[PDB]
């Protein structure tokens, strides 16, 4: 059971580089607009406590130099929307995709394109975490590369890198420019909230774990929504609602396991740990597989 | 740290669906060349003991339909390369990346493009264990899919998945169709050798992990290349070599750690495991990270 993110190929043909002044890095170009974050237009000293409308206002179209592979693109208009800046471009994009821009909810999962300097380097599946931060990899330059889901023949772009914090976990926005979580685009100490287990995660990936034949963690044992949300909120799991079950329902009726009974073996993970045993070759519990992912990747 | 896939944009625009009889699978397009498992030509009783040869005989060109995407292909010529079936067509790909076919090692990484009718569904990256096999999520119809590595603008295609085995992982070709190890293309009862942990990806991968500041598994201790392989054939680790201290040498020198002080390091995690800690994430040891795949992720 792979961490499997989605064919990269659609977004691939909308990433462009996008230089203002010393800065350079990555934009998202669908129709006759770029997407990048606005820090596109600081130096390394702005960044420190930045006034963006004034910093924005000393910058005219003729400063922002946006390349895609070897074609230049001249700049109409230029605005700032929340924390992204909008380039209106002459050339609408030949290679644009059927898309819509999403906010992603805390737990959802999505694929990263990571680019540096407009061109694509690798594509890899992550979860939103509780917390509104990412795990990821993202070394300088990667900045305005995306996170998308695909929905048949349309991207839904969920998510746009704008920068590391000193846990070493990643921040960014909505293509609307709102930041995931409490977060500012400004090079100051930002404490992302305690991070929580996403508990629905777990448990889809334990109805994977079972269906891939991997069934040993299951135990004679039943239990309650309270008695196991009170072991959750020990473990500093989500705690699990109806909406939560309801998800599960297809995973529970494909298996013929209760949801509660699954809850059950999780506590008895929780209390007793793992015991040196492996779960579909993972010696920790994974949480960033949804039960649609899981669904997505048992019937293909 | 992620395990990053390529992106797959390039591998997308190959993929054609292709159906003789009853039996539909995935076949890679370049030029005027579809390539496929041979097994297509197979119905169910077949595949429990195959004359390919004799199967292929009772088979014409206009008995294999190949689709990409809604426009139908004519075949003009057949081939049997070893297990994989070469179907000649009339319109070359236009779509045809910069491309070559390589027989990759034991111990390396490539990317596969999970594919079911001819339709990508999802990527991810994968190493080829010591054995020939690959642990990956492949379902019925996913046979055809591709394995690959990008270098620059050149798709390297490595991999073309044919089977899964009795314990769940996975046998296939090269692209000139010879299995990597003891498989053949028949559903019979087949052994993977004992599988083995590639020690040079799993030191690549304590490197990474001492460059993202994880450095808790670092010792006083030192050792020698003998005294360490004598360590490792007792945890079924891929024996050291100096090639293999060679290829670490950037790494080495990077961080400013001597390959046997890493080497001693290791050495102490099995002896003693892992404590309940950590090393970026991983409560186990990770070997599907190359030397190579840690500098690219590391310098972008
Ligand atoms: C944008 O390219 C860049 C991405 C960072 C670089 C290291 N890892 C990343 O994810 N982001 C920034 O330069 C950003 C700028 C602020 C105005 C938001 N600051 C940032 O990421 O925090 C500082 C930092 C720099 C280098 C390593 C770790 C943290
Ligand atoms: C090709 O589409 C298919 C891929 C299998 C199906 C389940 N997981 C896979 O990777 N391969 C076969 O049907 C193959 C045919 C032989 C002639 C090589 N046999 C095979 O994979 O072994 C039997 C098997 C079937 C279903 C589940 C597990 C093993």
Same mark, same amino acid.
């Given at each position: 059971?792979?961490?499997?993110?989605?064919?990269?190929?659609?977004?691939?043909?909308?990433?462009?580089?996008?230089?203002?002044?010393?800065?350079?890095?990555?934009?998202?170009?669908?129709?006759?607009?770029?997407?990048?974050?606005?820090?596109?237009?600081?130096?390394?000293?702005?960044?420190?406590?930045?006034?963006?409308? &004034?910093?924005? *206002?000393?910058?005219?179209?003729?400063?922002? =130099?946006?390349? $895609?592979?070897?074609?230049?693109? #001249?700049?109409?208009?230029?605005?700032?929307?929340?924390?992204?800046?909008?380039?209106?471009?002459?050339?609408?994009?030949?290679?644009?995709?059927?898309?819509?821009?999403?906010?992603?909810?805390?737990?959802?999962?999505?694929?990263?394109?990571?680019?540096?300097?407009?061109?694509?380097?690798?594509?890899?599946?992550?979860?939103?975490?509780?917390?509104?931060?990412?795990?990821?990899?993202?070394?300088?330059?990667?900045?305005?590369?995306?996170?998308?889901?695909?929905?048949?023949?349309?991207?839904?772009?969920?998510?746009?890198?704008?920068?590391?914090?000193?846990?070493?976990?990643?921040?960014?926005?909505?293509?609307?420019?709102?930041?995931?979580?409490?977060?500012?685009?400004?090079?100051?100490?930002?404490?992302?909230?305690? &991070?929580?287990? *996403?508990?629905?995660?777990?448990?889809?990936? =334990?109805?994977? $774990?079972?269906?891939?034949?991997? #069934?040993?963690?299951?135990?004679?044992?039943?239990?309650?929504?309270?008695?196991?949300?009170?072991?959750?909120?020990?473990?500093?799991?989500?705690?699990?609602?109806?909406?939560?079950?309801?998800?599960?329902?297809?995973?529970?009726?494909?298996?013929?396991?209760?949801?509660?009974?699954?809850?059950?073996?999780?506590?008895?993970?929780?209390?007793?740990?793992?015991?040196?045993?492996?779960?579909?070759?993972?010696?920790?519990?994974?949480?960033?597989?949804?039960?649609?992912?899981?669904?997505?990747?048992?019937?293909?």
């Amino acid at each position: 059971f792979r961490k499997m993110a989605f064919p990269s190929g659609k977004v691939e043909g909308c990433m462009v580089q996008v230089t203002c002044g010393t800065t350079t890095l990555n934009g998202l170009w669908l129709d006759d607009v770029v997407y990048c974050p606005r820090h596109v237009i600081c130096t390394s000293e702005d960044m420190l406590n930045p006034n963006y409308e &004034d910093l924005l *206002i000393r910058k005219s179209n003729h400063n922002f =130099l946006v390349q $895609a592979g070897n074609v230049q693109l #001249r700049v109409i208009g230029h605005s700032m929307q929340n924390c992204v800046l909008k380039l209106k471009v002459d050339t609408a994009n030949p290679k644009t995709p059927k898309y819509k821009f999403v906010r992603i909810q805390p737990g959802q999962t999505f694929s990263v394109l990571a680019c540096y300097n407009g061109s694509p380097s690798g594509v890899y599946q992550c979860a939103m975490r509780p917390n509104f931060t990412i795990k990821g990899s993202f070394l300088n330059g990667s900045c305005g590369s995306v996170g998308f889901n695909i929905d048949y023949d349309c991207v839904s772009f969920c998510y746009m890198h704008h920068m590391e914090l000193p846990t070493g976990v990643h921040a960014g926005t909505d293509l609307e420019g709102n930041f995931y979580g409490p977060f500012v685009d400004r090079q100051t100490a930002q404490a992302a909230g305690t &991070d929580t287990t *996403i508990t629905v995660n777990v448990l889809a990936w =334990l109805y994977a $774990a079972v269906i891939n034949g991997d #069934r040993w963690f299951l135990n004679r044992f039943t239990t309650t929504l309270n008695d196991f949300n009170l072991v959750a909120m020990k473990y500093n799991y989500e705690p699990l609602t109806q909406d939560h079950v309801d998800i599960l329902g297809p995973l529970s009726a494909q298996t013929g396991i209760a949801v509660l009974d699954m809850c059950a073996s999780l506590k008895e993970l929780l209390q007793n740990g793992m015991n040196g045993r492996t779960i579909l070759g993972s010696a920790l519990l994974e949480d960033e597989f949804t039960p649609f992912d899981v669904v997505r990747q048992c019937s293909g």
